[PDB]
Amino acid sequence: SKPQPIAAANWKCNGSQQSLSELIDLFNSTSINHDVQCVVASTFVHLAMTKERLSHPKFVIAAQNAIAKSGAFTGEVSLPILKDFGVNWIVLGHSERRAYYGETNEIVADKVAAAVASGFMVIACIGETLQERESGRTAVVVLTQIAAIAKKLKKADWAKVVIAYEPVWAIGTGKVATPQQAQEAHALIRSWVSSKIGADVAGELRILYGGSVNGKNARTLYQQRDVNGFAVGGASLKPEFVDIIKATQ
Amino acid sequence: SKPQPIAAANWKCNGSQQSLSELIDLFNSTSINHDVQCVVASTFVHLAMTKERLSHPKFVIAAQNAIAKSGAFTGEVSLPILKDFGVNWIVLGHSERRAYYGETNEIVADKVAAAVASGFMVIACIGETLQERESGRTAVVVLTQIAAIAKKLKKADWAKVVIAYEPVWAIGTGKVATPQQAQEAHALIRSWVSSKIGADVAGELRILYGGSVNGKNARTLYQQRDVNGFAVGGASLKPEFVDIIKATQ
Ligand code: NA
Ligand code: NA
Ligand code: NA
Ligand code: NA
Structure with missing residues (x-):
């Protein structure tokens, strides 16, 4: 059966002190009685307050990015700085960083490897x-992306790895991905991990859906065989993120 | 009379909670009895603790980077987020971001203009x-970089602009940039601002030296016609930064 699900809130580059404190307390108010790891990835600026306001025992705090080492990298935040700050989860390789901020497959893979080596739980994004x-290259691109990451890890590292599949292709179109399309990509990923890494790793790996999800379609997306939770964008800044948490049963 | 000097500490991608707390309290302990604006540019993650712990009346806090607007930009921090966070100074266009993170003259210029329009004091870096x-291209490059910024601004915007000259050329060689080399580059910038924007603007503009500054050479560098302070790298993480402050008297 499925491993522990994850409900991840990627706030992206958003938030004010007052609006986040209120959303934080909404999350604090939620009764979550099943086994699920909830994750809040705020901007670097808001990590201190999120550490301070978020008291729900099923929530942990994550960063949205980092570089591997401290030093002369004005504007960036390193893994050691996040670790010293008590942040043990991180989102790496998000489609927006791959498109806007120069993160090739190799750059993502080296960041993921460095984060695992530093003790982080990593949500590594592909899609x-x-x-x-x-152009018929879904499997080419997705398996190239994950192999680039895999080649920099050891089998035991995957205990600290979570995969998030982003259906980037659905943005701008008039139709979100279907649950069948989501399950198709997740099943492809898990099949690859079983074949190249190990069936034991594949059975324990969490593969999170990273497309648009709301309280109405989250339950159906989670009902899919190879879906282990969500890495949520805009809906994670809203009260309906609670309904997404509840959709992981 | 020179305009008010600035002593800017660019901590870059460095710091732990304990070591920054002690460094902040050292800054807090300093007696500064002349008119100078001290600036601490910490990582995004440490902005909160620097806001809480830095109480010296001659100090303000700064970010080391931002993008112009909030939205779907995972990992980045926007100007509105920083403004909501009470951060009113920002370093933009640092040579490290131009080299490593794709910041062309245009990208730097658009960030500077957005930060000025949002109410920020901007330390804009060129070099x-x-x-x-x-290649004999010092004047070509420096004046191209500042013209790219200037054309996105209006004359009155320069009241919120500080220029930091970075002698990137000095790193890696065995020869330290001399005080006279620094002064000649600042005079070039000053002369250009006088001709193209206005003599009034040039007289009020702070042009900071952003090369290797320490407690031993800071006074010699400041006692030059067109140097108005410093944008300090490694020494700004050290007690020596206090001596750099004193050198602007
Ligand atoms: Na809160
Ligand atoms: Na609170
Ligand atoms: Na259903
Ligand atoms: Na279902």
Whole structure:
């Protein structure tokens, strides 16, 4: 059966002190009685307050990015700084950083490896664009992305790895990905991990859906065989994130 | 009379909670009896603790980077987020971001203009590399970089602008940039601002030296016509930064 599900809130580059404190207390108010790891990835600026306001025992705090080492990298935040700050979860390789901020497969893979080596739980993001999917390259791109990461890890490292599949191809179109399309990509990923890493690793690996999800379709997405939770974008800044948490049963 | 000097501590991608707390309290302990604006640019993660713990009336806090607007930019921090956080100073266009993180003259310029329009005091960084200075292209590069910024601003915006000259060319060689080399580059910048923006603007503008500054050479560097302080790298993480402050008297 499925391993422990994860409900991750990627706030992206958003938030004010007052609005986040209120959303934080909403999360604090939620009764969560099943086994699920909830994650809040705030901006670097808001990590201190999120550490301070978020008291729900099923929640942990994550960063949205880092570089591997401290030093002369003005504007960036390193893994040791986050570790010293009590942050033990991190999102790496998000489609927005791959598109805007120069993160090639190799750059993502080296960050993921460094984060695992530093003791982090890592939500490593993969996924293909619309031009890639329409040209028949979904499997090429997605398995290239994860192999680039895998080649920098050891088998035991995967206990600290979570995969988030982003259907980047669905943005801008008039139709979100279907649950069947989501399950298709998740099943492809898990099949690859079983074959190249190990069936034991594949059975314990969490593969999170990273497309648009709301309280109405989250339950159906989680009902899919190879879906272990969500890495949520805009809905994670809203009260309906609670309904997404509840959709992980 | 020179305009009010600035002593800016660019901590870059460095710091732990305990070591920054002690450094902040050292800064807090300093007796500063002349008109100078001290600036601490910490990592995003440490902005909260620097806000809480830095109580010296001559100090303000700064970010080391930002993007212009909030939205779907995972890992980045925007100007509105920093403004909501009470951060009113920012370093933009640092040579490390130009080299490593794709910040062209245009990208730097658009960030500077957005930060000024949002109410920020901006330390805008310019400077030429070794290959550029060896090519006899110091004036070409520095004046191109500042013209790219200036054309996105109006004359009154310069009341919120500080220029930091970085002698990138000096790193890696065995020769320290001399005080006279620093002064000649500042005079070039000052002369250009006078001609293209206005003599009034040039007289009020703070041009900070952003090379290797320490407690031993800071006074010699400051006692030059067109140097108005410093944007300090490694020494700003050390008690020596206090002597750099004193050198601006
Ligand atoms: Na709160
Ligand atoms: Na609170
Ligand atoms: Na259903
Ligand atoms: Na279902």
